[PDB]
Structure 1
Amino acid sequence: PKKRASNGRNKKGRGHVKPVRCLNCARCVPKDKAIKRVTIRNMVEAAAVRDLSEASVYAEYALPKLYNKLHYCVSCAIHARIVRVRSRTDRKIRTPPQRK
């Protein structure tokens, strides 16, 4: 039977969507179907932000961030636990998980 009303992607009123490569395995996945995550991490880990600030020649120097948008295929994401199998009724919930 039909598992999802969206067919597991996000294509409505559209014919074709160009693919993207999974970050992990380089598999061609449609752009609307790919699991996309935007990560903004500190470029220096919090353990080293101290000794690097002490070694800094600049008073009040801000450490730059690391901006990245990651694309995963369904297999990459499920394997890496980026997304998990949800119950039949919980599948419909499409709000971001309440963790942050």
Structure 2
Amino acid sequence: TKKRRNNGRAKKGRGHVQPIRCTNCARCVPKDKAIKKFVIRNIVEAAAVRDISEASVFDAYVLPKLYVKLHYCVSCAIHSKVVRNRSREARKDRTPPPRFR
């Protein structure tokens, strides 16, 4: 029986969507079906910042960041705990998780 009204996708009013490769498997996934994450991290972690500024020759130097867009297939987002399963009604909640709090 049918589970999702959108068939697990975002495809509406078009026939074909170009595929992409999963970051973890290298598996072909439609771009509208893949699980996408934008990660903006710091190059150095908080375990290394105190040892980096004390050696920096520039006063008030701001350390750079790192920008990566990651694509997952449905299997890796579940195995890596990126995406969980949830109840039938909760499945209809498409608000992003309250991380911004």
TM over 0.5: yes
Q: How far apart in 2 are the matches of 1:50 and 1:78?
A: 36
User: Which residue of 2 is the match for residue 11 of structure 1?
Assistant: 11
User: Do structure 1's residue 53 and structure 2's residue 53 form an aligned pair?
Assistant: yes
Deviations 1:35-81 (A, max 9, x none): 00011111100111111011111111110001111000000101001
Q: Which runs of 5+ in 1 are unaligned?
A: none
Q: How far apart in 2 are the matches of 1:6 and 1:58?
A: 53
User: Which residue of 1 is the match for residue 78 of structure 2?
Assistant: 78
State the AA in 2 paired with 1:49.
Answer: V
Q: Which runs of 5+ in 2 are unaligned?
A: none
* C-alpha displacement of 1:99: 2.7
Q: How far apart in 2 are the matches of 1:50 and 1:62?
A: 13
Q: How far apart in 2 are the matches of 1:43 and 1:68?
A: 12
Q: Secondary structure of the equivalent of 2:54?
A: helix
User: Which residue of 2 is the match for residue 39 of structure 1?
Assistant: 39
Question: Percent same amino acid among aligned pairs?
Answer: 74
User: Do structure 1's residue 30 and structure 2's residue 30 form an aligned pair?
Assistant: yes
Per the normalisation by structure 1, the TM-score is 0.97
State the AA in 2 paired with 1:14.
Answer: R
State the AA in 2 paired with 1:8.
Answer: G
Deviations 1:10-52 (A, max 9, x none): 0001111001111110100000000000111111001111110
Q: Secondary structure of the equivalent of 1:71?
A: strand
Q: Secondary structure of the equivalent of 1:55?
A: coil
State the AA in 1 paired with 2:34.
Answer: A
